[PDB]
Amino acid sequence: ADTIVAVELDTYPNTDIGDPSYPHIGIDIKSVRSKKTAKWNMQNGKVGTAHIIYNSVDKRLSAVVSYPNADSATVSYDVDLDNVLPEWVRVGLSASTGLYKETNTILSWSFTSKLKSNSTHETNALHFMFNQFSKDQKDLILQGDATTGTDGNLELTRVGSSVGRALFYAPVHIWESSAVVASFEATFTFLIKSPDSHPADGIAFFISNIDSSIPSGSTGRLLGLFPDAN
Amino acid sequence: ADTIVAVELDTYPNPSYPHIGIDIKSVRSKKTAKWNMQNGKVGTAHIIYNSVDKRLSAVVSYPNADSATVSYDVDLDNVLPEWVRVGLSASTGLYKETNTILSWSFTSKLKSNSTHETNALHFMFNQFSKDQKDLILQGDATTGTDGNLELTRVSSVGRALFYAPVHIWESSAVVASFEATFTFLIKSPDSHPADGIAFFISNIDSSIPSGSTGRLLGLFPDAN
Amino acid sequence: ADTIVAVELDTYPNTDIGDPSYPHIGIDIKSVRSKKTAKWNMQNGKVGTAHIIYNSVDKRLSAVVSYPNADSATVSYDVDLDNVLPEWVRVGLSASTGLYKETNTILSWSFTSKLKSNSTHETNALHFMFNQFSKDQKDLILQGDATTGTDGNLELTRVPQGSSVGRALFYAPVHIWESSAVVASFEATFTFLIKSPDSHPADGIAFFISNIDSSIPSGSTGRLLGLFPDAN
Amino acid sequence: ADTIVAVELDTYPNTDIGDPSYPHIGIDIKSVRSKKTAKWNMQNGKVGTAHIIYNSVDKRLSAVVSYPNADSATVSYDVDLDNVLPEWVRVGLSASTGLYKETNTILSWSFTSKLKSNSTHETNALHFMFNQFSKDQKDLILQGDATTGTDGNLELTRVSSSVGRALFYAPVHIWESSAVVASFEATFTFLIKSPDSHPADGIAFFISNIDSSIPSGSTGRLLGLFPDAN
Ligand SMILES: [Zn+2]
Ligand SMILES: [Zn+2]
Ligand SMILES: [Zn+2]
Ligand SMILES: [Zn+2]
User: Fold this and answer.
1) Which positions are annotated as binding a carbohydrate (chain B)?
2) In angstroms, rounded to a whole number, what is the distance separating the alpha carbons of residues A133 and B7?
């Protein structure tokens, strides 16, 4: 299967296994059973922002989700991604809807990754920023029900029970054995919108092997990321 | 064929001198300037363009020397497709010379007019690795030797294109602009090598055209 | 006096001598008499964006002003700033109101300046970005009626009657050019909201570059945009 | 006195008070008695690089110092800078020499600080980079023996017991009560050079109140930062 490191915004009622019986943000390392979680107060129809950061000096992957005029939920996890991920990966977003009609709208998305080498300054860097998606977004690989262009946004899920992913087209070198400091950072703004006020829903920024594709039956609480709940 | 906009560093013996030129769809530069190639020195090339001026400019300098600069008014929206790929290219004549790229960086932005809808792509390589998956190598081009990109084989032709398509312009941007810098080392035992390097912008599926050797820099099929 | 290079958004009625009789954006080099202009359709109460760019390879100073869902006014001028400006300067914004009540609100402001040297990559760079100003904005030098913090914005002009003049300059001197750079360039963007009850306000806003000790010149009210001491 | 948060490269034999008995890199919070240290192998005459990073999601201040073709000494410390530093500060470099002649040369210096607010994208940012200092470097406030321009470098200490500091001119807003994530990052390359092979010496990146100045008698081991060894 795909190796997948992800930061999920999960509102699924999956009081299923290690799953919080409440909406939470969690860090997932190769499994849908989050290695760490924190309670998140989803706000239906509000635009929230997620910031994920990681650097190899700390080896700590962190994420903060906030909504204007509210609190932020933050979650961290010590992990050395060099041991988990392959050197070259693809980064993307993903979402899955439950039995409900709700939309998983991405208003903006940016990412930056850098590899500073120890030989005085050999910095390599990749940075992309989308503040407006277009109908024919060729630097994105869309998977599932995901589409771009409607109002200049990226609709991950079809516009229930939908799954869609968007991955940036160029492979990203997230680490190399020679960097003295490798680090990345991503930010995206999203709008979860549902008529039922308790929608079971999921969005996640993720990092996977470059050929990753939606695994069979990874619907609902598996966020289009995992093939099973193991 | 491919649509190609390029900035060439041409020492091939036709102007009748080494020059840097701006090429729009043809190997016959729309504008040129004399360039003093320095065999074995590391030079830097900066290419910039913005849609407010519609001027594509380039400066090539060597440490402790002069710079050759060249500009050309052109509105790229009329020439290039909206989505392109950017890359470097080089071709050697009958000589053994190397076309070494030590570093390469690029930035492209599309500011929209709806208060700040800026889209951006930026990549920078100060060190290439043996398995450089974000580059598409063509011809004799190879990466990794000493952490460099060897465009030509050590009569060679090689090109390196960044993997992700780039959106160079969109009808709705109030200002679209890009900028590229790359450092290169042209080294040859004969002190007057016929040689060529070029940063270029082409259709995404561009490939080295048949017989685009020597002076056609791996870019053009004929001298038209 | 101060050396001033500015890009003005001028709706003042100086139908005085060669002066455009319409709202224009213009490039001013040391004088309120624009070296070049273009017509601009001010939109009262809308938020507009201005981008100013210059590089030493082209030696062309350009500006575009746009409002969402409209057209843009753009203006350029060939000039080598090395010949006009001192090597170290301060950059800032300025505005002046006429007899009208109107506000000159700056919603955001960013700047970037770089000096690439020719010695393989000796790039120096300064970049600042404000998307929210605060009540005590210490990195800004405020002059005149200008104030920060109301709703996280910069009010250039003051919000009995009469005119107003205010300027905000970034605190750190900026090195705009140095004899050794193979390419020097800067870029600024700011969003503004000009709002007035009269639908034809006489008003003026400008991004400008001056000597580090520049200060509002005496009597530089109204059409002189807080920048110039006289209409010469 | 000044509020000072600093990252030191200390080779002083100051087996003086809590002071390690070996060359170390340490994180100092208001006192010359490092809140945390790590052993550093100083290389006389080589060019080293120092990367300092901090973010308010982890609240961890970290530093790595490496020499080309060598190892790195890294050091971290959990601290929420909001509780220590004032909202507005100035950042700078500092060095002091012992009874020895040695030079503390800074070849390059870059800094970035950001305050992302929570109201969708209200990011404020300050970034400066020096790869070449000039004789009349007006955006720097030079203190003590520090001087710029010799070969395009910054000589913190007097090149002929020396103390010199260089601070960037503009105050920096390091934190504000409303940012969801505040973070900074600094990198600087230095060259310590001495004829004695065990020079007692000290360099430090630091953050202080905007009006900070070299405190009286802060020579030698007090790195031009502290008034006493408390
Ligand atoms: Zn979960
Ligand atoms: Zn030619
Ligand atoms: Zn005017
Ligand atoms: Zn110590």
Assistant:
1) 195, 215
2) 30
Provide the token pair at C144: 């005149």
* Residues of chain A contacting D60 with CB distance shorter than 8 Å: 58, 60
Nearest chain B alpha carbon to C110 = B116
D118 touches chain C (CB under 8 A): no
Q: How far apart are CA C165 and CA C201, in angstroms?
A: 15
In this structure, are strands A73-78 and A60-66 parallel, antiparallel, or unpaired?
antiparallel
CB contact under 8 A, D181 and A49: no
By CA distance, what is C63's nearest residue in B? Answer: B52
Strands, E, within C151-196: which ranges? 153-155, 164-170, 174-175, 181-195
Partners of A76 in beta bridges:
A62
Distance (Å, whole) CA C32 – CA D106: 44
Q: For an interface test with D, which of A71, A180, A183, A188 has the most D Cβ atoms less than 10 Å from its Cβ?
A: A180
Tokens coding B56? 């594509």
Are the beta carbons of A27 and A63 closer than 8 angstroms?
A: yes
Its domain, for residue B107, covers: 1-224
CB–CB of D175/D56 below 8 Å? Answer: yes
Annotated binding-site residue? C223: yes
- Tell me how close the Cα of D121 comes to any Cα of chain A, in angstroms: 8
Please list every residue in chain A whose beta carbon sits closer than 8 Å to the beta carbon of residue D76: 57-58
Structure tokens at C39: 């017509």
SS3 B200: strand
How far is C-alpha A149 from the chain's CA centre?
Answer: 20
At B162, phi and psi to the nearest 5? -65, 145
Chain centre distance of CA C46: 18
**Chain B nearest-CA residue for A176:** B129
Q: Does the beta carbon of A160 lie under 8 angstroms from any beta carbon of chain B?
A: no
- For residue A132, report the distance from its CA to the centre of ligand 1, in Å: 29
**What distance in Å separates the CA atoms of residue A97 and residue A114, rounded to the nearest whole number?**
33
Radius of gyration of the CA atoms of chain B, in A:
17
Question: Is the Cβ–Cβ distance between C128 and D128 less than 8 Å?
Answer: no
Enumerate residues 6+ apart whose C-beta is below 8 A from B90. Answer: B99, B151, B152, B156, B157, B158, B159, B195, B196, B197, B198, B217, B218
Q: How many CA atoms lie within 13 A of A4 on its CB side?
A: 30
C-alpha to C-alpha distance for A137 and A148, rounded to whole angstroms = 7
Q: Measuring CA to CA, how many Å separate A112 from each of A91, A182, A183, A184, C113? A: 11, 11, 8, 5, 22
Minimal C-alpha gap between A70 and chain D (Å):
9
Instruction: Find the helix or strand (DSSP H, E) in which D28 lies.
Output: strand D24-29
Q: How far apart are CA D164 and CA D224, in angstroms?
A: 7
Query: What's chain C's Rg over C-alpha atoms?
Result: 17
CA dihedral D153, D156, D158, D161 (to 10 degrees): -160
Q: What CA dihedral angle connects A222, A226, A227 and A228, to 10 degrees?
A: -60
CA of D98 vs chain A CAs: smallest distance (Å) = 27
Q: Which tokens is B206 given?
A: 């561009």
CATH number at residue D5: 2.60.120.200
Please check whether residue D177 touches A, CB under 8 A: no
Give the residue from chain B lying closest to A127, CA to CA. Answer: B122
| Cα gap D78→A76, rounded to integer Å | 14
- The technique is X-ray
D123 beta partners: D116
Residues of each annotated binding site of D = 201, 221
Pick from B94, B58, B62: which is nearest to B200 by CA?
B58
**Could you count the other beta carbons within 10 Å of the beta carbon of residue A196?**
13
- Smallest CA-to-CA distance from C225 within C69, C28, C15, C21 is with C28
Surrounding ion ligand 1 within 5 Å at CB are A 10
Residue D118: CB atoms within 10 Å: 20
- Counting the structural domains of chain A, the total is 1
Cα dist from C113 to A158, C77, C128, whole Å: 44, 19, 9
